[PDB]
A paper describes a structure:
Through an in silico approach to identify new macrodomain-containing proteins in this organism, we identify a protein containing regions of similarity to aprataxin, APLF and PNKP that we call APL (aprataxin/APLF-and-PNKP-like protein). Interestingly, the N- and C-termini of the APL macrodomain align with the C- and N-termini of human macrodomains, respectively, indicating it has undergone a circular permutation during evolution. In order to assess whether these permuted macrodomains retain important structural characteristics, we solved the X-ray crystal structures of the isolated permutated macrodomains found in Dictyostelium APL and O. sativa Q10MW4. Structural analysis of this novel macrodomain indicates it has retained the core features of this domain family, including the α-β-α sandwich fold consisting of a six-stranded β-sheet flanked by α-helices.
A selenomethionine-substituted protein of the Dictyostelium macrodomain was used to collect single wavelength anomalous diffraction X-ray data, which was phased with AUTOSOL. Previously solved structures of classical macro domains indicate that they consist of a non-parallel β-sheet core flanked by α-helices, with a cleft forming the binding pocket for ADP-ribose. These structural features are conserved in the permuted macrodomain found in Dictyostelium APL, indicating that the permutation does not drastically alter the structure of the domain. Most notably they retain an amino acid (D175 and E439) at an equivalent position to D723 of human ALC1 and D20 of Archaeoglobus fulgidus AF1521 that is crucial for ADP-ribose binding. Consistent with the permutated macrodomain of Dictyostelium APL being able to interact with ADP-ribose, we observe that this domain is able to bind ADP-ribose polymers in vitro. Overall, these data indicate that although the macrodomain has undergone a circular permutation, it has retained its tertiary structure and its ability to interact with ADP-ribose. Strikingly, deletion of the macrodomain almost totally eliminates enrichment of APL in chromatin in response to cisplatin.
Residue numbers in the entry: 1 to 221
């Protein structure tokens, strides 16, 4: 759970099969209940940090999936403000109806991130994803790779490719996903595991570290 920060790596020439195209949620904002003003600033700033560092790397495509309820003109303006009116062409926000909507899966990204918990198991919010992967198969592969389970602020990539049991998933074969990344963002919701208290001094630092971890995974990926 120790904070490690960004470990980003510039790549000018890349393998098209290893393109850094990531679909990811607006971490901790819906079910987890993270303060949206705070999540917006952290998200926008982390995104801009990564994209600026990687100026001129055109393989990178970032698609942030935002639930309809949270999506607003004010939200988009807030992002614009953090980007100093220079919104990077490589970053898009995609409105989805809810965390289980089918529209989220065919966005053309080789890496697909989902929120998870320490258990690294299916949640009610990513049920649809897990049905598509086959729950038992994916959970078994997850447990084999990460036998000591997950820590808040970290991500856990699982390849659908090198993974024999998952290669035939619609997610891989039809929707072009190579890697599913389980993202352990900060939960603020008393009804979900490992809830942080409202003014925890660790909440903001750990959400940022979640983004760093995610983008570190992308740069390896």
């Amino acid at each position: 759970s120790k904070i490690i920060g960004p470990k980003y790596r510039k790549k000018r020439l890349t393998d098209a099969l290893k393109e850094r195209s990531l679909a990811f949620p607006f971490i901790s904002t819906s079910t987890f209940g993270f303060n949206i003003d705070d999540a917006t600033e952290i998200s926008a700033n982390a995104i801009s940090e990564y994209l600026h560092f990687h100026e001129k790397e055109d393989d990178i495509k970032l698609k942030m999936m935002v639930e309809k309820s949270i999506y607003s003109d004010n939200l988009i303006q807030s992002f614009k403000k953090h980007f100093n009116d220079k919104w990077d062409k490589r970053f898009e926000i995609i409105k989805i109806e809810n965390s289980n909507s089918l529209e989220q899966f065919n966005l053309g990204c080789k890496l697909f991130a989902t929120e998870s918990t320490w258990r690294l198991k299916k949640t009610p919010q990513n049920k649809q994803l897990y049905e598509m992967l086959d729950t038992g198969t994916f959970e078994k592969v997850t447990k084999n790779l990460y036998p000591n389970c997950g820590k808040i602020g970290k991500v856990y990539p699982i390849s659908l490719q090198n993974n024999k049991q998952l290669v035939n998933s619609i997610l891989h074969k039809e929707y072009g996903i190579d890697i599913v990344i389980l993202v352990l963002g900060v939960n603020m919701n008393p009804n979900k595991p490992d809830a942080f208290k409202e003014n925890s001094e660790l909440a903001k630092p750990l959400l940022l570290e979640t983004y760093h971890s995610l983008f570190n995974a992308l740069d390896n990926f």
